[PDB]
Design a protein around this ligand. Structure first.
Ligand SMILES: Clc1cncc(-c2nc[nH]n2)n1
Length: 308
């Protein structure tokens, strides 16, 4: 039967609703509506499997295909950040930069206590999701990562990029998960990060699907097809491309602003719906980052402040 009108309409609505619920946290429709439409599409695809697509909303429920866990090199190795533990560390960081390249703007972001991941897009389609591993070689968990609504299955523009993000379990879902384990005398997860790890390490993407995971994307391997001239522009651009980014980022003019940001988030981190382990500070301008270069191990243009 030619079901293309209804299939397309279901794709449109479920994509809208998923984005509203999981990326914006702003539903327009009750869960009963989402569930109803998803169920209808699932039945359409069961009875008319020619309508299945690689980026169908039904992908989010997981499938029979198992994540290979194969060792796979990232297109581009993921960076390792140096750490800061106090103000003096940050003043040193700032001083090294300003002595070499002049005064800079800084991008400040929350360091999500998650599983670092790389998400590879080809022609705008999500085609590979790897754990960070050793920074060069990770494990292929693509099939599990596809169940996370916050990871777009298809971007707004058909780019070939490898984005970098942190996958995580929101705290309240972690806690309610542990309530469920307590009721069934199971060993509780130690924390949200361990729960996210356990969930992504399943062989069964259908289990991963029912766990409440999300992501925040913080960079990309290659800026060639980005118009961004800065990290802050780049994140805005990722937003416009369809990715999930952290809205608590801020551009600050100087190291005083950086300290202010850390002072703010030290007090407010308690109220966030996910765990963070620090604050990442980057020279904002992309050309300036390039100018600062890398040590043998780490960017000279970025630092991870770690909470006590
Ligand atoms: Cl380059 C890098 C490495 N690890 C984390 C981050 C990050 N995390 C949040 N924003 N940026 N960036």
């Amino acid at each position: 039967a030619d079901l293309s009108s209804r299939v397309n309409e279901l794709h449109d609505l479920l994509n809208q609703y998923s984005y509203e619920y999981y990326v914006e946290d702003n539903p327009s429709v009750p869960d009963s509506e989402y569930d109803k439409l998803l169920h209808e599409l699932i039945k359409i695809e069961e009875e008319h499997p020619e309508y299945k697509t690689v980026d169908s909303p039904t992908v989010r429920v997981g499938g029979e295909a198992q994540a290979s866990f194969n060792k796979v090199n990232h297109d581009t190795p993921m960076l390792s950040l140096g750490n800061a533990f106090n103000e003096d560390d940050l003043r040193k960081f700032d001083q090294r930069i300003r002595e070499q390249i002049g005064n800079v703007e800084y991008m400040c972001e929350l360091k999500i206590d998650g599983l670092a991941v790389s998400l590879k897009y080809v022609d705008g389609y999500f085609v590979q999701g790897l754990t960070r591993g050793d920074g060069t070689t990770g494990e292929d968990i693509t099939e599990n990562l596809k169940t996370i609504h916050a990871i777009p299955l298809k971007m707004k523009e058909p780019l070939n990029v490898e984005v970098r993000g942190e996958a995580y379990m929101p705290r309240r879902s972690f806690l309610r998960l542990n309530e469920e384990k307590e009721k069934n005398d199971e060993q509780l997860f130690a924390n949200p990060r361990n729960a996210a790890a356990g969930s992504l390490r399943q062989l069964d993407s259908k289990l991963t699907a029912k766990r409440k995971l999300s992501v925040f994307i913080y960079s990309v391997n290659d800026f060639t097809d980005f118009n961004a001239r800065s990290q802050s522009e780049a994140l805005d651009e990722l937003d416009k491309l369809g990715f999930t980014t952290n809205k608590n980022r801020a551009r600050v003019n100087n190291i005083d602003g950086v300290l202010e940001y850390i002072e703010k988030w030290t007090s407010q981190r308690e109220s966030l719906p996910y765990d963070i382990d620090g604050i990442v500070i980057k020279v904002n301008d992309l050309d300036q980052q390039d100018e600062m270069g890398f040590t043998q191990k780490s960017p000279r243009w970025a630092i991870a402040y770690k909470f006590p």
